[PDB]
Write a protein that binds this ligand. Sequence first.
Ligand SMILES: OC[C@H]1O[C@@](CO)(O[C@H]2O[C@H](CO)[C@@H](O)[C@H](O)[C@H]2O)[C@@H](O)[C@@H]1O
Lengths: 141, 141
Amino acid sequence: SFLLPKLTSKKEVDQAIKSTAEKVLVLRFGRDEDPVCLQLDDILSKTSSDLSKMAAIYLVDVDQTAVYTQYFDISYIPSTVFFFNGQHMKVDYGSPDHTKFVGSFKTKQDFIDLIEVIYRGAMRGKLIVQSPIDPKNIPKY
Amino acid sequence: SFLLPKLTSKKEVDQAIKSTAEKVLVLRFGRDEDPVCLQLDDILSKTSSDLSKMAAIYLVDVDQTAVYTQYFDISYIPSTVFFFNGQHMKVDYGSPDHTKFVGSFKTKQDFIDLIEVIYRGAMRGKLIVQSPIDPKNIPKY
Ligand SMILES: OC[C@H]1O[C@@](CO)(O[C@H]2O[C@H](CO)[C@@H](O)[C@H](O)[C@H]2O)[C@@H](O)[C@@H]1O
């Protein structure tokens, strides 16, 4: 894109939501050094060019964006949130929470496939889409 | 007014979310004839005027438009959703779902006190707030 932008404040996330027009805004909430975020971030970086017409991808430091981290109840990282023209786009990936996509992707193409689904739903005026793919597994207690 | 505005299509809801500036937008998803909706609509109507500096209230017909009902995962009516400057507000009532209030308020004052807290927090940039309502007064269902 080439590079992935980093956001480190509530105000920067607000500005990305407000200024990103006609593309899916992808907000990866995480920590750059977290191993699962490192895995996702590599997919994001690699796929970003092929998705540049459909999506603008930003990395967000979960620890520095309290208003958003608390609002989305980010409890496991990475957690990725989607917006389109200032509307929060929800994604049903079979789990009860449609608000954020928790975990990394199996493959780069799975991520592209999700993004296409979001984009084409949002262009049609949809606000919630079903994901054609399932997330990679996040182990819990 | 006493007779709160009705929204009967997705585009009308989209527009109220965009057009309500600097006040809490209150969206009541329900049916005007339903008994619990009648209880809640009486409180919304009777408090609307003295809340008019802090909130704009709308009645959303779930039998004429349904896009938003799926978007907010609404299974039971009434369900009431809060927004501020285009972005959804969460409220922790003491139950797991912070995205919407389900059922009717026990008293006028509970709704007033809630709007006060939502408005002040939203004006300070918050997106999630703590409900002030005593849990004994929160419908359980
Ligand atoms: O993930 C648990 C952690 O989240 C907080 C909010 O930061 O509260 C959430 O989880 C509580 C326990 O499940 C819920 O009862 C509450 O509704 C929810 O917001 C913390 O208080 C909690 O330690």
